[PDB]
Amino acid sequence: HHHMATPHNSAKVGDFAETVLMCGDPLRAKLIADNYLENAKQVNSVRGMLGFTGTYKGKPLSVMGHGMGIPSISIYAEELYNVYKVKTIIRVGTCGTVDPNVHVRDVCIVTASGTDSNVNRMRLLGHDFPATANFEVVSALVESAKALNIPTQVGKAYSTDIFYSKEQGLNEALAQYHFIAVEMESAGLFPIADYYGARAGCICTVSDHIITHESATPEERQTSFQNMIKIALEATLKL
Amino acid sequence: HHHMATPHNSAKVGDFAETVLMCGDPLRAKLIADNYLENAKQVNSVRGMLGFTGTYKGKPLSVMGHGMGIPSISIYAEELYNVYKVKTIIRVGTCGTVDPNVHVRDVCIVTASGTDSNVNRMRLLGHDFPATANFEVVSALVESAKALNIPTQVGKAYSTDIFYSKEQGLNEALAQYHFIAVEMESAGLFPIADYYGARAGCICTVSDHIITHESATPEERQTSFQNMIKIALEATLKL
Amino acid sequence: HHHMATPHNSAKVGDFAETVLMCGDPLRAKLIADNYLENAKQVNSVRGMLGFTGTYKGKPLSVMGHGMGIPSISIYAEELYNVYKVKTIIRVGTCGTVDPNVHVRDVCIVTASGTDSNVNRMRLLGHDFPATANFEVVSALVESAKALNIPTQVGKAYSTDIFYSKEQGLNEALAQYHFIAVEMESAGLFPIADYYGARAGCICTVSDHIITHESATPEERQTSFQNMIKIALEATLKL
Amino acid sequence: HHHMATPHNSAKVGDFAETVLMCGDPLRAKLIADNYLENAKQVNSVRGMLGFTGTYKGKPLSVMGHGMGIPSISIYAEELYNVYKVKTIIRVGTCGTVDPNVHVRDVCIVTASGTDSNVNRMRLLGHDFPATANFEVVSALVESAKALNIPTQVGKAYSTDIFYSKEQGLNEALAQYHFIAVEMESAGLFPIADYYGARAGCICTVSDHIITHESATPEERQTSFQNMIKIALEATLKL
Amino acid sequence: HHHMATPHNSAKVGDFAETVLMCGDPLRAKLIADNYLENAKQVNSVRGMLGFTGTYKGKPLSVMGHGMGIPSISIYAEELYNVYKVKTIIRVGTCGTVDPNVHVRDVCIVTASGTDSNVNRMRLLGHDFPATANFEVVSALVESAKALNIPTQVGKAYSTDIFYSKEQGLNEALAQYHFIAVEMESAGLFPIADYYGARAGCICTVSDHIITHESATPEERQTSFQNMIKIALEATLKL
Amino acid sequence: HHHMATPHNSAKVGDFAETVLMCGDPLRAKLIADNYLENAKQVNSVRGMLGFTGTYKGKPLSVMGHGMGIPSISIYAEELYNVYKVKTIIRVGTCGTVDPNVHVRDVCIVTASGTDSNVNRMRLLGHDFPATANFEVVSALVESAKALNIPTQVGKAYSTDIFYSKEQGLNEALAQYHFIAVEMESAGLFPIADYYGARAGCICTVSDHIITHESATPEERQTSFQNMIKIALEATLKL
Ligand SMILES: Nc1ncnc2c1ncn2[C@@H]1O[C@H](CO)[C@@H](O)[C@H]1O
Ligand SMILES: Nc1ncnc2c1ncn2[C@@H]1O[C@H](CO)[C@@H](O)[C@H]1O
Ligand SMILES: Nc1ncnc2c1ncn2[C@@H]1O[C@H](CO)[C@@H](O)[C@H]1O
Ligand SMILES: Nc1ncnc2c1ncn2[C@@H]1O[C@H](CO)[C@@H](O)[C@H]1O
Ligand SMILES: Nc1ncnc2c1ncn2[C@@H]1O[C@H](CO)[C@@H](O)[C@H]1O
Ligand SMILES: Nc1ncnc2c1ncn2[C@@H]1O[C@H](CO)[C@@H](O)[C@H]1O
Ligand SMILES: [Cl-]
Ligand SMILES: [Cl-]
Ligand SMILES: [Cl-]
Ligand SMILES: [Cl-]
Ligand SMILES: [Cl-]
Ligand SMILES: [Cl-]
Structure with missing residues (x-):
């Protein structure tokens, strides 16, 4: 038995950096920590929603899974901004697209x-x-x-x-109004950041074209992820 | 690399029994499998959403996590009924209560x-x-x-x-109309079962009284879980 | 001029049993009273909405019309639970169906x-x-x-x-999600019972198939009614 | 057994005049017919929803109950305009008021x-x-x-x-925007008349002031009704 | 710099008559003032929303533009009823129609x-x-x-x-329910009049048939306007 | 009589530049044209909604009023993107604020x-x-x-x-979620730009603090406008 700072997170207060990357898949959070963070330690294991804190190029940075859907990200992000005093969250994820000029493997930055x-x-x-x-x-x-x-x-x-x-x-x-990404979480994240006077954004890679049926292969998804994660990590140095 | 029957589940078609228990926490799914199933094997690991198939008192039964919130359970349950041909899902979970005559540790069966x-x-x-x-x-x-x-x-x-x-x-x-359980998933499960001509139910134990602030201790939650899971498992023999 | 305990009911307080059957047609309430109740007396005549109190197999039981639609049943049922201290109402009625596996003359019990x-x-x-x-x-x-x-x-x-x-x-x-009965009142009854900490249910017989156009004859509707009313009356003995 | 032109009305096609007064209480429809119509006959008895056809000062006129609430009046009025080819319906009724300058016993004409x-x-x-x-x-x-x-x-x-x-x-x-009458039916009647290219209106007498708690006595309600019904009957001669 | 009684109107309190005609186009307000009012003076110029006060057949009357859409008329009419103590506003305008029996150049009085x-x-x-x-x-x-x-x-x-x-x-x-006029403002005007215990109406001429594509020529629109404005002006003498 | 390319704009096709500034007050559009544009001509006068086309530092630029409210800007902007083939619209306006850290005279750029x-x-x-x-x-x-x-x-x-x-x-x-500007038009502009595959933005100056009641004087509003308009004009050179 360990003390629970929230019902969903065993991390001690202070165990998260002020900047956090979040992705839906906790196993992808582990991959990010293992391959891009230094000074890394696991800080949460509750419900298998792995989270980690370390540094990227010397600057404190955490990475944690958020699960699938608005209710799930809302729990984790509310706690990060409120209990863990996080200032910036960037969601890193995958998406579909319907836009005729957006293609599989494209990197989408969400406004x-x-x-x-x-x-x-x-x-x-x-x-x-x-x-x-x-x-x-x-x-x-x-x-x-x-x-x-x-x-x-x-x-x-x-x-x-x-x-x-x-x-x-x-x-x-969605196509008529040029929505570029279809996902399940960012609309829940941004208003929570607003509530706490904090900051949030989202970057995603296109896994599938919903209209044309094109789909990225496993290797293509890995390459897209490598591009997107490098963009996100470098962005944290400016935030 | 393994073949993916769905984007969220590595189980092969046929690897799920026709009856499935689902709980939000995949680690609790593992506990259920380890302590109540025989002939058990792990059939899914994607996104850490552990699922298992075995038998309870000789009858085929699976158990899998569903994550938190309606969008998450909807993904997993849609796939179970559609791709895996499941006939009955019972959600086993925890809840809060506001009802003045419902108490922490009570078992609630959801209509x-x-x-x-x-x-x-x-x-x-x-x-x-x-x-x-x-x-x-x-x-x-x-x-x-x-x-x-x-x-x-x-x-x-x-x-x-x-x-x-x-x-x-x-x-x-909620109290005025005698809602007995507050949770985040069952309202998403039942209509999906309807769509597939299949069956669903839910049983939960009260972890917290939202009005009085009473809260079950870790040991009390384990005892409540033992009662609830035995009810659910015995019910599967009649379904 | 008689004293009015409510604007819609001339029954004296205490004149209703704790268990009440309600149907839309007041003339059908009279038929139920005349053919299944003993010790029966008419207790309401306002707006022609006939109501009666007697016994079924010795147990106090009332029967009253509720009119057509949610606003009408809401008036009568609110008054029964509030002013007349009724504990259980069972709506007995007729319905249409769209479900491909439900047939004219079927008895439907509403969950x-x-x-x-x-x-x-x-x-x-x-x-x-x-x-x-x-x-x-x-x-x-x-x-x-x-x-x-x-x-x-x-x-x-x-x-x-x-x-x-x-x-x-x-x-x-409605067919896709396996709604078995189409009527006009039960959705108004159940939440009023909740408000008063009381009990309600509904049983109906299929008069018409909305998709196939099948329709029960007058004699078939009488036979269906005889089956349904016997079920409801016997159920009151357990409530 | 008599032939049913609709599920709710035993009147033969042609048995309703082109102009109809409707009130919620079928017993009040009988009173209107008995005291103001000549050449009168009862044309409907189904569900106790009494309706009558005769003449007022020589001009064909019917009167029928409509029950309580929008769903009930919608059934009866839809049938009158559609099956019975009625051209004008005037609802005659009672209402409450919240307006500070409207008083019990006032006659309200609804726009x-x-x-x-x-x-x-x-x-x-x-x-x-x-x-x-x-x-x-x-x-x-x-x-x-x-x-x-x-x-x-x-x-x-x-x-x-x-x-x-x-x-x-x-x-x-309601008071802020000077709604003069609170009732349960007219909003359902007027759009049905529109659908059929026909005409509808409503006149009501104030039985109760919802704010001040004033309430008309039985005799006062009879006098108010006498005034309102005379207005409605005389209006039919111009319609 | 002149004193502003509202953010949108430079008229001094008292500079508007108790009766006001409003049209969307301020240039049409000027035409009405120049051709039908005596004793006329311009009382507002803010945002080009010309307004004028004078007399029609000796009775005080103002005319002012209201711009296009509910939010625009709501600003101007709220101010007229509240700050300028206006009692009656008649909107005079143009509209389209979808009704099969309404024709280009028809005058429509809005209920x-x-x-x-x-x-x-x-x-x-x-x-x-x-x-x-x-x-x-x-x-x-x-x-x-x-x-x-x-x-x-x-x-x-x-x-x-x-x-x-x-x-x-x-x-x-709209055609099924016999809406006779399609415009953009009257639904915003009438509830504001209600709030202030004041009066409002609307009269419009059909410029275009939306279904048949018929369209009034410039000269036909002038003739329609002459008919409509004379109706409105004569009506002010009774209000 | 002049030919009308739209019901609301007398400008000939081609008479608008590809970049347009829009403000609610047409008189402010005239001020912008007179003081910041060269090669300027008036291209619209309909309904007093003045619009102008010229150059700013040699680059084609138009400026036009849009009136007050979403329905008004929607008419003008739809026409500009559709009929006049405009590619970029920047709304330049005024606003209130409720945010505790935003002050009268601040320049707000709307995301x-x-x-x-x-x-x-x-x-x-x-x-x-x-x-x-x-x-x-x-x-x-x-x-x-x-x-x-x-x-x-x-x-x-x-x-x-x-x-x-x-x-x-x-x-x-609004304050809880850090909305910085309260106005009446931008939410209507941005989706129309999306529909046409075009671009839009908005910049506004704070005229009033809605909570504290602070209000900019006429001279302060002129200075704020000078700052905002210079920002917008310089931005057009990059668009
Ligand atoms: N087409 C899609 N629709 C919805 N979510 C998607 C899609 N593609 C990727 N995702 C993302 O991955 C998960 C669903 O597989 C969600 O958490 C979501 O953010
Ligand atoms: N009070 C509560 N409110 C919402 N969800 C609850 C509550 N208590 C337990 N839960 C359950 O546990 C998770 C939230 O901790 C959800 O998946 C939900 O089903
Ligand atoms: N097809 C149907 N649609 C709606 N109500 C129905 C239907 N069949 C029977 N009913 C019942 O009978 C009345 C309508 O005839 C209503 O009170 C309703 O409860
Ligand atoms: N205060 C009221 N609220 C609602 N309906 C009323 C009221 N007073 C009279 N009525 C009318 O009488 C019936 C309710 O008693 C309804 O059919 C309605 O038209
Ligand atoms: N077909 C129409 N649709 C909407 N508004 C119309 C129409 N015809 C005329 N109008 C009126 O003229 C303006 C739009 O040109 C609006 O202010 C409105 O009141
Ligand atoms: N507080 C405010 N609320 C709404 N609109 C405002 C406000 N302040 C300035 N405006 C702007 O000015 C006009 C209202 O005066 C609108 O067109 C709007 O864009
Ligand atoms: Cl992920
Ligand atoms: Cl769980
Ligand atoms: Cl019945
Ligand atoms: Cl009545
Ligand atoms: Cl006009
Ligand atoms: Cl402006």
Whole structure:
């Protein structure tokens, strides 16, 4: 038995750096820690949601899984900003796309995310609350990719509660308004950062084209991940 | 590299029994498999969402984690009913309560679950779709608890997208209408079972009283879990 | 002029038994009283909404009409639970079906009911509140039918505000999720029972198949009614 | 057994006049027929919802009950306009008021009615559809009252699904915007008339002041009814 | 620099008559003042939203532009009723029609207006609040047109936020329920008049048939305007 | 009579530059043209909504008024992107603030805007569609202000339909989530730019603090405008 600072995290207060990368898959958090962090230690194991704290090029940085969907990321991110006093979270993830000019393996930097969730209406008296990335975070990601000579798409994501969509007309509307990424979490992250006066952003790589059916192979997903994670890590040095 | 029957599950088709217990914590799925299943093998490890298949008293039974929140359980349960041809899922979990006559450590058998999610409105043209447990599953749980001489509360749950509620008046309304359990998943499970012509139910133990602040100790949670899991396992023999 | 305990009911306080059967048609309430109750007297005549109190096999039991639609049943049931101190109401009625495996003359026992009404959103801060039958009532109906060797369908109803639907896609969605009964009242009854800490359920017979156009003849409806009413009356002895 | 032109009305096609008065209480429909119609016959008895056809000052006129709430009036009025080819319906009823300048026993002529029902959103793609009385009907009622030297209030009603309101702030908002009548049916009637290219209106007498608690005695309600019904009957001669 | 009684109006308190005509185009307000008012002076120039006060046949009358859309008219009308103590506003405007029996150049007198705006839900606890014209204003317009031997259509308008509609099925629904006018402002005006215990109405001429594509020429629009404005001006003498 | 390329704009096709500044007040559009454009000509006068085309530092640039509210800007911007083939619109405006760390006279660069309008739900199947500024436009504004040594706040706006708010709790929620600007138009502009594959942004100066009641004097508003307009004009050179 270990003391629980939250119901979902065994990390002691202070065990997270002020900057955190989060991905849905805890096993990918372990890969990031093992391959890009120094001075690294595991700080959470509860529910298998592995989290780690170390340094990247000398600067404190943590990485942790967030699970799948808005309710899951909301738990972990609320706790990080509130209990662990985190200042900046960058979600690093994968996505689909419907946009005719976005392609599998593209890196997408998210400026804002729509959603079919109610969580943001509940925060703003039932109205439209845009889940919006912090501009300094977006800019740090854009500038890092430029320095690395990695092309990026910059624009809106759509965070759905329903991976297995049965919704006629959704993809056509997303394409009409040039949503570049379809995922399940960023729309929950950004308003929590707002609540705490903190910062958040998101960068994702396109695994699948929802319209054309193109799909990245395992090796292509690894290469896309290597590009995206390097962009995110370099961006943390400016944040 | 192993073949992926779904993006979230490495189990081969046929590797799940027709009856599955699901809990949010994959580490608890491992505990259930290790302590109550025979002939057991691990069938999924993707994203750390451990799943296992074996037998309970000779009858095929699987157990797998579902993560936290409606979007997460919806992925895993949709795949189980669709790809893995599962017929019955019983969610085994923990919950809070606001009801003045429900107490920490009580076992709650869920007949239906409300929610603040939009996922069920999207299935029924925007209207009210009650997430309803299958009657044979509810009855099997009730009868199993009676045979084990374990008291149970039977009634409505509320599945929220937001663990860290800031919503004035919610607890008072839940208490006024005698919702017995507050959790985050059952309202997503029951309509998916309906879609596939299959069966689902839920049983949970009260970890915390949201109004009085009472909270079960670690040992009390283990004892509550032992009672609940025995009820669920015995119920599978009738399903 | 007689004293009015409510605006809609001339019955004196105490004139209703603790258990009440309700049907939409007051003339059917009279038929039930005349043919199944002993010690019977008429206790309400206001607005022609006939109600009666007597005994069934020695146990106090009332029967009263509720009119058509959620607003009408809500008036009468609110008054019965509040002013008349009723503990259990079973709605006995007729319904349509869209389910491919439910047939005209089938008896349907309702576990929960969806709706296109707003009345339940208004009770739960705008969220999804499942109108859910009390489990002891459902079980009493199921067990009574078993003892009488009368087959039953057990599952969800849909209570609509609009008998003359013009809504494209509604029947297809109801069938997809295996709603077994289409009626106009149960979704209003169950939450009122919850408010008063009381019990409610519903049993109905299929008069019409909405998809195939099959329709029960007058004699077939009488036979279906005889089966359903015997199930309900026998269930009251266990409640 | 008699032939049923609708499920809810035994009247033969042609048995209703082109102009119909409707009130919620079928016993009040009988009173109107017995005391104001000549050449009168009963044309419906189904569900006790008495309806009658005769003449008023030589002009064909019917009167029938509509029950309580939007779903109930919608059934009866849809059938009258569709199957029975009715051209004009005037609802004659009772109401409460919250307006500080409207008093018990006042006669209210309704120009439009708000509602907490969804039935009108479902007709207009989810938008705001005002349930609006036909201007010729409103004018006929206003002019008839003037000729009879009976004062009237003219303005908005609010048709609620919930007689037993628990809704904080509703009465204050209704008063702020000068809603003059609170009832349960007119918002369902007016859009059905629109659908059929037909005409509808409503006139009501104030039985109760919801804010001040004033309430009309039985004799006062009879006098108010006599004034209102004379206005409505005289208006039919101009319609 | 001049003193600003509101942020949007340089008129001094008292500079508006108690009766005001409003049209969307400020240049049309100038035309009305120049051609129909005596004793006229310009009282507002802010944002180019020209307004004027004078007399029509000796009776004080003002005319001012309101801009396009509900938010714009709401600003100007709120200020007129609140700060300038106006008692009656008649909107004079142009509209489209979808109704099969309404034709280009027809004069439409509005009894109530639907909308796709949220502004009226926000006033009535989320419910349906009909934007309803004052009956004395409607009657004054109807009677004035009769005296001038100018035919009129009397009925519902629809005030949309979106001139360039992309909404499948909207026109068909508007036609089904006999909405006679499509415009962008009246649904915002009527509830503001209600709030202040004041009066409002609307009269419009059909510029375009949305279904048949017929369109009035410039000269035809001038003739339609001459008919409509004479009706409105004569109506002010009765208000 | 002049030919009308749209119902609201007399400009000939080609008469607008590919880059346009828009402000609500047409008289302010004239001031911008008169004081910052060369080669300038007036291209629209319809409804007094003055628009002009010229050059800024040699680069083609137009400026036009947009009126007040989402419906008004939607008309003008839809036409500019569609008929006039405009590629970039920057809204230049004024706003209020509720944020405790934003002050009167501050320049706010908008990354996204929330709203109480329905126009964006209607574009995305009823879901949350974030009205999001184009990143290149935001960056051009940020970089221009940096080069001019003018401090800026960068973050979310809220576009309301209701200038005269009566909404309890709105300001507290806006402050809790650090909305920096309250205005009435940007949430309508950004999705129209998306539809056309074009670009939009917004920059505003704080005229009033809604919480503290501080208010900029006329001279202070002129100085704030001079700073903001110089930022916007310099940004057009990079777009
Ligand atoms: N097409 C997609 N739809 C939804 N989520 C996706 C998609 N592609 C990748 N994801 C991401 O991966 C998970 C689902 O496999 C989610 O957590 C989500 O963020
Ligand atoms: N009070 C609670 N509120 C929400 N979820 C709860 C609560 N107590 C236990 N849970 C369950 O445990 C997880 C949150 O800790 C969720 O998956 C949920 O099912
Ligand atoms: N197909 C149906 N749709 C709605 N209500 C029905 C249907 N069949 C029977 N009913 C019941 O009978 C009445 C309508 O005839 C309602 O009170 C309802 O409960
Ligand atoms: N205060 C009230 N609230 C709702 N309905 C009322 C009220 N007063 C009278 N009525 C009318 O009478 C019935 C309720 O008693 C309804 O049919 C309704 O039309
Ligand atoms: N078809 C139409 N749709 C919307 N508004 C219209 C229409 N025809 C005329 N209008 C009116 O003119 C303006 C739009 O050109 C709006 O202010 C509105 O009141
Ligand atoms: N506090 C405010 N609320 C709303 N709009 C504002 C505010 N301050 C400035 N504006 C802007 O000025 C106009 C209202 O005066 C609107 O067009 C809007 O963009
Ligand atoms: Cl991941
Ligand atoms: Cl668990
Ligand atoms: Cl019945
Ligand atoms: Cl009545
Ligand atoms: Cl105009
Ligand atoms: Cl401006």
